[PDB]
C-alpha cells in the first residue's frame, strides 16, 4: 500500500498512507524558519516554537494542555533554518479533536500580552540546555562566518533580545509566512478520505504565497572564541552545492570516503582516512570527521576537529592535507565502492522508524511535485563516478574558506595560513 | 550520604523494594508511576526489575534550600495514591502507559532487543494484545490495593550526593511513609 | 611626541587605562554608577573526555535541528 | 537487526573477579583467530553495517545492524565473535591501561553515581550491591 | 633650569627638574603591559594595577592607605599595552616616606591568597564603568582584529578569567618584568641630589633585562557586534608606521588635514574635510574623525564614524572616498600649512600641565638616550612635505584593511565591499 | 519628591544654607567637608556659593532598600563634627585642602579662569 500525493485549490499539499499501525502520526509542515528574519526581529521564531500552547481563538491554554494529556498524546514542534513542523501522535480514533487543536494553533493564535511576557524567561533556559553540548554553538558561529545575511541568522534567540520580543512581531510573522501555498499535511496511519476530512478545515485559511525573502550571500569569514578549556573545537568549510543535486551526491560520497562517523563500539576506524591521518600527528585524545550541509540556494562542505590545545595546529593541518591528496587524484575504486555501501546502508537505516519517515516525506512534499521512493535514491547514489568525487575535492581545495574555532587558541592557526 | 557543598545542586534517590519481572502487579505499579510523573529543576519516577526483587522509587535534583519541601511533596503523593485514588486520574495513567508501550517498539533494533530480553526474563514473547488486556483490568481500587501492598509503611533506601545538609533525617523520612489520620 | 597622550589627542582616554588608588583630595569627573549585568542560569558541571573511546563520535557531520514538546524535554540534534 | 543475548551479568561475579564482563566487552571486537586484528573491523565497515554491545547487572548483548542481503555473513561473524575471540596479552594490557585511565578522572555523571550508591545500600552483603565496572584495584 | 638625564650601573634611568612648584611629582615608569601576556595568563596586568595597595614586606595595607591619606597625597597607576607607570604627588617635604611606599609596592609585594581573593570581584565593576563609554570596547575589538598575537591582547580582563587570576601568576609576572634595566625614575619639583638619595634604595633590586616577548603580527580581521542600538559605531584602519619615525609625522599631518577633532563649541568644523564630506551624505546626527596609533613595532591609521543605523553605508563610504582624493593628489599648500599649525599648537597645549609633562618625559626616558625638547619636535613637524602626505594616503588606500562595527548592522557594509 | 520606580537607583540631595563668597567661615567649612568626604555606590559633599547665600550639603546614589541607613550615617557624621571633633582628623582635612588648592591651578586655562 502506497502514498498518494495531492494538492487542493488553495495550493495546500496533502499526502497519506494507511499502514496498519496502532499509533497514527500527522505532521503539518511549513516553509518558515530563522532565514526569514532580519536584524530588526531576530529571535521571533524561537519564541514562536516555544509559544505552541498559549491560548487561541478556538481553545484555552488549559484546555489544550489537559486535553492532550488526557489521551496520552503529544504535540511536538521542530524547526530548521528553512522549515518548521508541528507533529501530533495519537492512538487510533483520537484524531478529530487533536486536529481541531492543530488548526487553532497554526491558523488562529492569540498572543496575549501577559502570557507572552510570562513565557519570555524560558528562552534563556532553553538556549542554556542547548549550549551545554559544545558542537551547537560552534556550528552556529560557522553559519555566521559563512554567510552575510540569511542562513547566517541564528536558530536560538540573541541574548540582547530576550525579554523584548513582542506580540505584534509574532502576529506579523505568522500572518506573512503561515500561508496555505507554503504548506503540506502528511498522515501515517490514516486513510486518504479521513485526511481529506481533516484538510477540509483549512480551506478558508490565508491564501497564496507570502514574503519570499532574500538570497543568501557568501562570506569568507572567521570567528574565534577564547576560553580556558584544554580542548579546542574547530570547523573549516567551503561552499559546495544545492540541495537535491547530482553534485551534492558527489559531495556525499566524498564525505563517506573521508569518514563520516564510527561503526564499531570502541573501534579504531581503520576504514577512515581522516582518522588514520590524524592518529599519526597526535598521541593524546582527538576526534575528527567530515561535514555536509545543503540548502535551497547554497551548501557547505568541510572538516570538523576536536583536539588538545597544544596539538590543534598539527591536527587541523594533518586533516586538511588528506583531502588534498584526493584532489590530486589518489583515489581508489575500492574506497569508492565501500563509501557508496556506507551511504546506501546509512540512508536505509535512517528511515526505519515512522518518526523520521514522516519528516523525510514532509521535507520532499514542500519542494517536489512527487514522492521519490528509496530505490530511486539508491540508483542516484550508484551513479556517482570517481571523477565526480575528485572534482568535488578540487572544488573544496580551491574555493574560499570559512573557519570557526573555540577553546584556548594559543596554537590554533589562522585561516590565512592553512 | 556523600556531602560536597561545592557541587551546584543536590541529587537524591529514594526507593522501596519491587516485586521482580515475574509478578503481575508490575502493570498496576506502572500506572501509578504515570500518575505521579513546581519546586526544582528535574524529577522522575522509576521501576527497576530483577529476577526476584527490584527497586521502586524516584530521583530528583534540587537547589540546596528546597530539598525538604520536595521530599514532603513526593511522600505526600505516595500517601495520596495509597489512600485516596480516584478513577479519573487512573484512566489518564492507563492511556499514558498505552502510548509508551506502542511508542517504544519502532524500528528493528528495539524490537530485536525486546525479543531477546523477553525470552531471557519471561521465557516467552508477550504480545501487545495481552498487555492491553492486562492494562484494561486496572482500576482505582486495584491501584489503592497494590500501592498499599508495596509502599505504605515500609522502610526506604535513600541515597544523596551534593550539598545535602537539608536532606531530612532518616527517622523523619521513615515517619513520612504513613499517615496518622488514616 | 612619544607618550600616547601627546600623540593621539581625543583617543588618548580609550588608548590608556588608569586606577587612581586610595582616594584623593579633588573629586573626579565621570563618576560612573554601576548597574551590573544579571547572572545567567546555574547548571551542572561538565564531564571531561580524557580518552579517544569517549571522544569517538563527538565530531559533527551534519547541521542541527531544534526541537520542543509539550510533555517531552526540549532537544537539539 | 540480528543479535545474541546472554543470561550473564555482574550479579554472578564474586569479589575476586568483579568486573570481568566489562573487561571482556572492551576487547570483544578486537580480533578472532579466523580474523586477526582489524580484519573483522574492516569487514564490518566494508558492508556498511554497525556493531554494538552492552553489559548490565543481569544481562549481556552483542548485535549487528545490516542490510537484509547480508544475513549469511552477519550470522557467520556473530558466531565467530562469541566462540573465537583472540585474548592476546598485548591487547589485554592495552585494555587494562584504557580502563584504568577511564576510571582515574571523574568521568561519571552524578545520576550514575547516585544510582550505584542506591544499589550498594539497598542490596548490601549480596551480589547485586556490586557494580558492573568493579573496583580499580 | 633644565632636565638632567642619567643612568646608574644597574641600568636604571633617572631624571629630574627643580621647578619651584609647591607640589612635587615623582613617577616610576616600567616597560610592562598587556602585550607581554599570553593566552594562559590573560588579565594579570589589570589585577596588578588594581592590587597597588595590598600588603608588602615593608608596610601593611592599613599603613599604606592611612599614611598616604594623612598628608593628602595620591598614588596613581596608569597603563598602556606597552608601559606601566606608578606616580606619587605630595607637598614639599613629604617625599621620603612616600618613596619607601613606592619602593615596597614595586620591588617587594606580597600577594596573600585572601587579599587577592577578596580583590577579584572589583575587576567586573571596573570593566563595567570603563565599558559605559562605547568607544572603548570598539577600540578593544579593533586591536583584536588588527593583530594576531601581542598588541591584540586586551587592556581589561576577559570575563572567563575573573575570579581565576592567582597569586602565583602575579609573582611570576613581577619577577620576570619589573627589572631595573626596564625602568626610569622621573622627578618634577625635586633636586637631582635628592632624587639620587631616592634612587639609592633601588640599587640592590632585580638586575638586567627580562623576558623580551614576541613581535606583533598583522591580521586582516573583521569583528561585528550586533545590538539593538539605533546608532552604529565603526572603525576602519590599516597599518601605518612605527613610533618615532618621519613617516609617522607624515601620517600625523594627514590626520590633521582630514580632521582630528573640534575647535569651536557647537561649531560646524568647516575646516574639516571628513566632516564636510559626510555632512552631504546624511541629514541626521553623525560624528566622524581620523585615527592614529603608533607602537614600538607597528602602527595603525584609519577613520572612525558614528551614525544612524540606516545611514551607515552612506557615511562610511563618503568618508573613505575623501581619503582617496588625497591619494590621487588633490592636496593644497593652504590645507597643509593649516594642518601643521593645528598640530604644533595642539602639541604645545598638551604639555601645559605638570601631569602630562611628566608622562611625556617618562615615555621618552624608556626609549631614547636623551630628552628631545619641544623646539626640535616643532622643527620635525615643519619638515614634512606634501609628497609625504600623499604617499601616506596612498599607503592607507592600498594596504589591507581591518574593520570593526557595533550596533544594528542591517545596513553596515562588509570590509570586502568598500 | 519625584517618584519613578522604573529607574535603577535613587538619587538624593540634601543641603542647608551657606554663607556666601565674602564670609571667612568658608575655609573652615571646606575642612569639615574634607573630613566627611560602605553602603552605596556613590557619595559626595559640596559647597555652592553665591553673593549673599549658598548651599552646603551632600549628594548620593543608593539601591532602593538602603536609603534610610545612608541618611542615618550622613546625619550622624554631621552631629559628630558639631559635637565631638578632634585635632587628629582636622589635621588630615587641612592637608587634603592644601593639596586640592595647589592641584587645581595647573596650566594656563584654570589660572585665567581663577
Ligand atoms: C505540660 C508540661 C510541659 C513541659 C513538659 C516538659 C517535657 C516536654 C518534652 C516533649 C516536647 C514535645 C514538643 C512537641 C513535639 C511536636 C511534634 C510535631 O508537631 O510533629 C509534627 C509532625 C511531623 O509531620 P510533618 O512533617 O509536619 O507532616 C505534616 C503532615 O500533614 C502529616 O500529616 P498526618 O495526617 O500524618 O498528621 C496530621 C494529623 C495527624 O493527627 C490525626 O489525624 C489524629 C491523631 C490522633 C488523634 C488525636 C485527636 C485529637 C482531637 C481533639 C481532641 C478531642 C478528642 C476526642 C474527644 C472529643 C471531646 C468532645 O494532625 C493534625 O492535623 C494536627 C491536629 C490533630 C488533631 C485534630 C484536632 C485539632 C484541634 C485541636 C484542639 C481541639 C480542642 C477542642 C476539643 C473538643 C472539645 C473538648 O506532624 C504533625 O502534624 C504532628 C501532629 C501532632 C498533633 C498533636 C495534637 C495534640 C493536641 C490534642 C488535643 C488537645 C486538646 C484536648 C482538649 C480536651 C478534649 C479531649
Ligand atoms: C498526667 C500524668 C501522666 C503520667 C504519665 C506520663 C506522661 C507523659 C507521657 C508522654 C506524653 C507525650 C505527649 C506529647 C506527644 C508525644 C508524641 C510522640 O512521642 O510521638 C510522635 C508522634 C508524631 O508523629 P511522627 O511519626 O513524628 O509524624 C508522622 C507524620 N506522618 O506524635 C503523635 O502521635 C502525634 C499525633 C497525636 C497523638 C496524640 C496526642 C495526645 C492527645 C491524644 C488524646 C486526646 C485526648 C486528651 C484528653 C486529655 C484530658 C482532657
Amino acid at each position: 500500500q502506497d502514498l498518494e500525493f495531492t494538492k487542493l485549490p488553495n495550493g495546500l499539499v496533502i499526502a497519506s498512507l494507511e499502514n496498519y499501525a496502532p499509533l497514527s502520526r500527522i505532521g503539518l509542515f511549513i516553509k518558515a524558519g530563522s532565514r526569514y528574519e532580519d536584524s530588526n526581529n531576530l529571535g521571533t521564531t524561537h519564541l514562536l516554537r516555544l509559544a505552541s500552547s498559549l491560548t487561541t481563538k478556538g481553545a484555552s491554554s488549559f484546555k489544550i494542555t489537559r486535553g492532550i494529556e488526557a489521551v496520552g498524546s503529544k504535540l511536538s514542534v521542530t524547526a530548521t533554518r528553512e522549515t518548521m513542523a508541528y507533529t501530533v501522535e495519537c492512538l487510533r480514533g483520537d484524531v478529530d479533536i487533536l486536529m481541531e487543536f492543530l488548526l487553532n494553533v497554526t491558523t488562529a493564535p492569540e498572543f496575549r500580552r501577559w502570557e507572552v511576557a510570562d513565557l519570555q524567561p524560558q528562552l534563556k533556559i532553553d538556549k542554556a540546555v542547548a549550549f551545554q553540548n559544545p558542537q551547537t554553538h560552534v556550528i552556529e558561529n560557522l553559519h555566521a562566518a559563512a554567510y552575510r545575511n540569511a542562513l547566517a541568522n541564528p536558530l536560538y534567540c540573541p541574548d540582547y533580545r530576550i525579554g523584548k520580543v513582542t506580540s505584534e512581531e509574532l502576529h506579523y510573522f505568522v500572518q506573512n509566512h503561515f500561508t496555505s501555498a507554503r504548506m503540506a499535511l502528511i498522515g501515517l496511519g490514516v486513510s486518504h478520505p479521513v485526511l481529506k476530512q481533516v484538510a477540509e478545515q483549512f480551506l478558508n485559511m490565508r491564501g497564496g504565497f507570502g514574503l519570499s525573502g532574500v538570497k543568501a550571500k557568501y562570506r569568507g569569514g572567521e570567528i574565534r572564541e577564547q576560553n580556558g578549556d584544554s580542548l579546542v573545537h574547530a570547523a573549516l568549510v567551503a561552499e559546495s552545492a544545492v540541495a537535491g543535486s547530482a553534485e551534492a551526491n558527489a559531495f556525499s560520497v566524498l564525505q563517506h570516503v573521508l569518514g563520516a562517523g564510527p561503526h564499531i563500539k570502541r573501534g579504531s576506524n581503520t576504514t577512515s582516512h581522516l582518522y588514520q591521518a590524524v592518529a599519526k600527528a597526535t598521541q593524546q585524545p582527538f576526534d575528527v570527521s567530515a561535514f555536509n550541509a545543503n540548502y535551497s540556494d547554497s551548501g557547505l562542505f568541510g572538516i570538523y576537529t576536536i583536539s588538545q590545545a597544544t596539538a590543534a595546529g598539527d591536527v587541523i593541518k594533518a586533516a586538511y592535507n588528506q583531502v588534498k591528496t584526493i584532489a590530486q587524484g589518489n583515489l581508489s575504486n575500492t574506497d569508492v565502492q565501500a563509501a557508496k555501501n556506507k551511504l546506501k546502508a546509512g540512508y536505509l537505516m535512517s528511515v526505519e522508524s515512522s518518526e523520521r519517515f514522516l519528516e523525510e516525506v514532509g521535507s520532499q512534499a514542500l519542494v517536489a511535485g512527487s514522492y521519490v521512493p528509496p530505490s530511486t535514491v539508491l540508483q542516484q547514489i550508484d551513479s556517482v563516478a570517481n571523477a565526480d568525487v575528485i572534482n568535488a575535492a578540487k572544488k573544496f581545495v580551491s574555493g574560499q574558506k570559512s573557519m570557526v574555532a573555540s577553546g584556548n587558541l594559543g596554537h590554533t592557526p589562522f585561516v590565512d595560513e592553512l | 550520604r556523600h556531602r560536597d557543598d561545592a557541587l551546584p545542586f543536590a541529587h537524591v534517590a529514594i526507593a522501596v523494594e519491587g516485586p521482580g519481572w515475574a509478578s503481575p502487579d508490575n502493570v498496576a505499579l506502572q500506572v501509578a508511576n504515570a500518575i505521579i510523573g513546581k519546586l526544582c529543576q528535574s524529577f522522575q519516577t522509576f521501576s527497576i526489575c530483577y529476577a526476584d526483587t527490584g527497586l521502586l522509587g524516584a530521583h530528583f535534583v534540587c537547589d540546596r534550600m528546597k530539598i525538604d519541601d520536595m521530599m514532603f511533596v513526593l511522600q505526600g503523593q505516595w500517601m495520596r495514591l495509597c489512600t485516596s485514588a480516584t478513577e479519573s486520574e487512573v484512566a489518564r495513567g492507563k492511556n499514558i502507559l498505552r502510548n509508551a508501550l506502542v511508542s517504544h517498539l519502532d524500528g528493528t533494533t528495539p524490537v530485536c532487543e525486546d525479543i531477546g530480553r523477553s525470552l531471557l526474563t519471561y521465557g516467552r514473547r508477550i504480545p501487545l494484545a495481552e498487555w492491553e488486556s492486562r492494562i484494561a483490568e486496572v482500576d482505582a481500587s486495584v491501584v489503592r490495593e497494590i500501592c498499599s501492598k508495596y509502599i505504605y509503611d515500609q522502610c526506604p533506601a535513600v541515597a544523596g550526593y551534593g550539598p545535602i545538609e537539608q536532606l531530612p533525617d532518616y527517622n523523619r523520612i521513615r515517619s513520612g511513609m504513613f499517615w496518622l489520620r488514616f | 611626541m612619544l607618550s600616547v597622550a601627546a600623540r593621539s589627542g581625543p583617543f588618548a582616554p580609550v588608548l590608556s587605562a588608569t586606577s587612581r588608588g586610595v582616594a584623593g583630595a579633588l573629586r573626579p569627573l565621570v563618576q560612573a554608577t554601576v548597574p551590573a549585568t544579571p547572572e545567567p542560569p546555574v547548571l551542572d558541571l561538565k564531564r571531561p573526555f580524557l580518552s579517544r573511546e569517549s571522544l569517538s563520535g563527538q565530531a559533527v557531520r551534519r547541521p542541527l535541528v531544534a526541537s520542543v514538546g509539550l510533555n517531552v524535554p526540549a532537544s537539539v540534534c | 537487526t540480528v543479535g545474541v543475548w546472554i543470561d550473564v551479568g555482574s550479579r554472578f561475579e564474586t569479589e575476586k573477579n568483579n568486573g570481568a564482563g566489562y573487561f571482556l566487552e572492551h576487547l570483544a571486537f578486537k580480533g578472532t583467530k579466523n580474523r586477526p586484528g582489524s580484519a573483522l573491523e574492516k569487514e564490518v565497515e566494508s558492508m556498511g553495517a554497525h556493531l554494538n554491545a552492552y553489559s548490565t547487572r543481569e544481562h549481556t548483548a552483542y548485535y549487528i545492524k545490516a542490510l537484509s542481503k547480508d544475513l549469511p555473513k552477519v550470522v557467520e561473524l556473530l558466531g565467530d565473535i562469541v566462540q573465537n575471540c583472540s585474548l592476546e596479552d598485548s591487547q589485554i594490557e592495552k585494555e587494562r591501561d584504557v580502563i584504568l585511565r577511564e576510571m582515574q578522572e571523574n568521568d561519571a555523571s552524578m545520576r550514575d553515581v547516585v544510582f550505584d550508591y542506591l544499589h550498594a545500600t539497598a542490596f548490601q552483603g549480596t551480589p547485586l550491591a556490586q557494580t558492573v565496572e568493579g573496583p580499580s584495584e
Side-chain angles (χ1 to χ4, degrees), chain A, chain B, chain C, chain D:
Chain A
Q1 196 149 6
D2 305 347
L3 278 158
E4 299 186 41
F5 266 33
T6 286
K7 193 165 74 172
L8 305 191
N10 295 69
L12 176 71
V13 171
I14 69 174
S16 197
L17 165 63
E18 168 59 320
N19 268 349
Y20 293 97
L23 191 75
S24 299
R25 250 171 281 251
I26 292 171
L28 186 55
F29 299 88
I30 318 180
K31 275 180 198 186
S34 59
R35 84 167 282 165
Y36 306 82
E37 297 170 359
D38 64 47
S39 60
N40 287 314
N41 62 334
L42 294 174
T44 304
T45 49
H46 187 193
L47 187 58
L48 187 53
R49 89 183 78 126
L50 296 183
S52 53
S53 58
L54 300 189
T55 190
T56 62
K57 295 188 179 188
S60 171
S61 185
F62 178 83
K63 183 181 180 67
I64 283 155
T65 309
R66 300 303 156 109
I68 286 177
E69 279 173 337
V71 291
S73 56
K74 298 88 132 298
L75 165 62
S76 315
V77 188
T78 303
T80 63
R81 288 156 146 96
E82 298 209 305
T83 62
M84 285 177 59
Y86 294 74
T87 294
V88 168
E89 307 185 346
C90 69
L91 312 172
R92 263 188 201 259
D94 299 355
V95 178
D96 313 55
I97 181 166
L98 266 41
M99 296 303 96
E100 178 59 23
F101 290 162
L102 193 56
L103 174 79
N104 320 139
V105 168
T106 51
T107 59
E110 303 189 352
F111 290 121
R112 280 177 193 194
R113 288 182 296 97
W114 47 94
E115 323 194 332
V116 178
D118 307 341
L119 186 65
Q120 306 271 342
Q122 300 236 134
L123 296 162
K124 208 189 293 284
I125 300 175
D126 186 56
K127 184 177 178 181
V129 299
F131 276 19
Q132 282 172 13
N133 168 8
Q135 278 78 331
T136 61
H137 95 295
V138 172
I139 266 55
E140 292 268 286
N141 286 334
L142 192 66
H143 280 97
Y147 298 108
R148 291 176 211 235
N149 44 305
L151 292 168
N153 288 341
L155 263 170
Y156 300 88
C157 188
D159 276 315
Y160 79 97
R161 276 278 290 175
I162 290 169
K164 301 192 299 177
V165 184
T166 86
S167 179
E168 297 77 22
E169 294 171 344
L170 295 164
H171 274 300
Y172 183 84
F173 192 90
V174 169
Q175 286 167 3
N176 284 274
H177 301 95
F178 283 23
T179 328
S180 48
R182 295 174 168 253
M183 300 189 135
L185 184 72
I186 311 295
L188 308 180
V190 188
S191 49
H192 228 265
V194 169
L195 195 68
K196 276 181 186 178
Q197 285 323 106
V198 178
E200 193 79 339
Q201 305 169 12
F202 291 92
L203 253 44
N204 302 306
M205 77 166 289
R206 278 179 304 271
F209 299 91
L211 311 167
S212 57
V214 291
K215 189 184 189 294
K217 296 178 72 173
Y218 190 71
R219 168 182 203 202
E222 181 187 46
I223 293 180
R224 275 166 159 252
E225 184 199 63
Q226 171 69 19
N227 320 298
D229 199 349
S230 55
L231 263 53
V232 50
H233 287 255
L236 177 75
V237 310
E239 179 162 48
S240 66
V242 159
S245 183
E247 175 187 11
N249 294 110
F251 270 104
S252 298
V253 170
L254 176 62
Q255 178 188 22
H256 280 97
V257 173
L258 294 163
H263 295 257
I264 290 70
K265 196 189 189 180
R266 311 197 165 96
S268 300
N269 313 290
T270 65
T271 191
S272 146
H273 276 293
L274 283 173
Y275 201 91
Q276 289 293 301
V278 186
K280 289 177 292 195
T282 192
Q283 303 297 340
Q284 306 287 128
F286 70 98
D287 191 30
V288 56
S289 67
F291 176 79
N292 252 322
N294 298 315
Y295 292 102
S296 174
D297 55 349
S298 184
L300 300 171
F301 169 86
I303 57 177
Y304 189 107
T305 55
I306 308 171
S307 52
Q308 312 301 313
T310 49
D314 297 334
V315 171
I316 291 169
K317 273 176 199 165
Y320 185 39
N321 283 0
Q322 200 58 16
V323 187
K324 284 155 71 72
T325 51
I326 299 173
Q328 294 165 3
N330 301 143
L331 178 69
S332 54
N333 294 347
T334 297
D335 294 355
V336 165
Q337 184 60 54
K340 290 198 270 194
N341 283 353
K342 290 177 174 71
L343 177 55
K344 296 163 73 175
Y347 173 66
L348 288 178
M349 291 171 189
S350 64
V351 291
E352 295 179 64
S353 56
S354 299
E355 188 182 334
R356 306 291 157 256
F357 177 69
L358 185 82
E359 292 183 319
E360 175 65 13
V361 173
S363 285
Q364 285 176 13
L366 288 179
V367 300
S370 184
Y371 167 72
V372 176
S375 64
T376 304
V377 178
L378 262 54
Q379 279 164 346
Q380 286 171 350
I381 297 177
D382 280 340
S383 179
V384 188
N386 297 31
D388 299 327
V389 178
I390 281 148
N391 278 330
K394 282 184 296 192
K395 198 179 190 180
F396 175 73
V397 170
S398 292
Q400 187 187 21
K401 306 298 185 302
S402 303
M403 186 174 184
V404 179
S406 171
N408 197 10
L409 307 173
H411 297 82
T412 316
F414 292 83
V415 60
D416 292 321
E417 48 185 14
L418 286 169
Chain B
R1 296 188 189 240
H2 185 326
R3 192 168 162 175
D4 188 338
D5 292 352
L7 302 185
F9 295 113
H11 282 77
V12 173
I14 175 168
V16 292
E17 195 196 356
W21 289 115
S23 106
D25 293 351
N26 286 292
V27 180
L29 287 168
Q30 282 318 19
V31 184
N33 278 341
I35 292 167
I36 291 171
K38 293 180 290 185
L39 290 168
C40 296
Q41 290 80 14
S42 188
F43 174 92
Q44 284 194 317
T45 61
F46 61 78
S47 283
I48 301 165
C49 294
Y50 290 113
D52 58 8
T53 184
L55 296 173
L56 169 78
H59 160 255
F60 60 91
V61 189
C62 279
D63 180 287
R64 62 190 72 208
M65 299 306 294
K66 290 189 284 187
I67 309 184
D68 204 21
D69 296 350
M70 182 62 98
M71 191 64 81
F72 178 81
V73 160
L74 168 59
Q75 278 182 323
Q77 292 306 319
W78 279 346
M79 296 298 96
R80 175 175 182 281
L81 282 188
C82 298
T83 51
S84 308
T86 58
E87 304 285 11
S88 193
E89 54 201 332
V90 170
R92 159 165 69 86
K94 288 159 65 173
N95 277 341
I96 291 165
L97 185 57
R98 287 172 171 126
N99 193 276
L101 284 182
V102 171
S103 297
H104 174 74
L105 299 170
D106 191 10
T108 64
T109 316
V111 171
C112 173
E113 179 152 50
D114 182 65
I115 294 165
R117 189 197 72 256
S118 199
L119 264 65
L120 296 183
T121 51
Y122 295 135
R124 76 179 172 101
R125 190 89 190 282
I126 296 177
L128 285 167
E130 182 174 345
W131 287 128
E132 219 290 300
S133 73
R134 277 180 204 291
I135 291 170
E137 290 172 338
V138 182
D139 63 14
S141 187
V142 170
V143 167
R144 259 166 292 118
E145 174 182 353
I146 285 179
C147 290
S148 304
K149 180 180 174 185
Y150 294 87
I151 302 179
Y152 187 86
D153 196 15
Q154 304 287 349
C155 311
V158 186
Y161 186 31
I164 53 166
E165 191 152 84
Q166 208 205 59
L167 178 68
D169 182 77
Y170 184 89
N171 276 309
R172 298 292 283 256
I173 292 178
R174 180 53 179 89
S175 289
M177 300 294 286
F178 70 80
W179 266 351
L180 287 169
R181 63 185 181 263
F182 184 56
Chain C
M1 285 191 285
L2 281 162
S3 60
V4 171
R7 176 71 67 171
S8 315
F11 290 105
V14 303
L15 290 162
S16 184
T18 188
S19 58
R20 233 73 203 211
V22 54
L26 285 166
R27 304 179 196 278
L29 289 78
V30 187
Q31 182 73 210
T33 304
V34 282
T37 187
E39 293 295 347
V42 180
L43 299 170
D44 279 330
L45 302 179
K46 293 173 184 171
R47 295 157 66 196
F49 296 99
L50 289 160
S51 62
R52 284 193 306 100
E53 283 73 5
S54 57
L55 274 180
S56 186
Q58 290 293 93
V60 181
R61 61 182 182 169
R62 199 165 291 126
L64 273 45
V65 186
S67 178
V68 66
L70 297 192
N71 47 17
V72 178
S75 184
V76 55
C77 185
Chain D
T1 306
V2 188
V4 172
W5 267 253
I6 305 175
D7 209 348
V8 181
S10 182
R11 64 178 294 174
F12 302 92
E13 287 159 17
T14 76
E15 67 177 26
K16 203 202 79 70
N17 67 350
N18 175 20
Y22 193 66
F23 210 126
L24 287 163
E25 191 196 307
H26 271 68
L27 39 65
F29 305 143
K30 293 289 201 300
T32 72
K33 67 183 191 172
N34 301 311
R35 286 159 251 256
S38 54
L40 177 71
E41 179 171 17
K42 182 182 190 167
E43 296 178 23
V44 173
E45 286 175 303
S46 325
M47 288 181 297
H50 292 262
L51 174 60
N52 199 32
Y54 66 75
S55 280
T56 297
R57 222 72 71 146
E58 188 168 58
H59 306 299
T60 303
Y62 303 95
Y63 60 101
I64 291 164
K65 299 192 69 172
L67 258 55
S68 307
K69 286 161 50 62
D70 300 332
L71 183 65
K73 303 305 306 181
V74 168
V75 178
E76 189 195 316
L77 266 62
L78 205 55
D80 192 47
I81 282 166
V82 300
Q83 311 184 212
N84 296 119
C85 277
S86 58
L87 296 179
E88 288 171 3
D89 300 334
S90 184
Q91 202 54 42
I92 289 169
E93 293 307 321
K94 283 176 70 168
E95 298 321 318
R96 195 193 307 282
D97 185 63
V98 167
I99 295 166
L100 284 170
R101 183 170 295 94
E102 182 156 68
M103 284 187 178
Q104 276 169 28
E105 296 293 339
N106 62 93
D107 302 1
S109 170
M110 286 182 77
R111 178 181 168 117
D112 294 351
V113 178
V114 294
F115 272 100
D116 273 22
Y117 282 168
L118 194 66
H119 278 99
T121 212
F123 304 124
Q124 52 177 267
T126 291
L128 224 41
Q130 86 200 331
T131 67
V132 172
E133 299 99 341
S136 60
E137 185 54 20

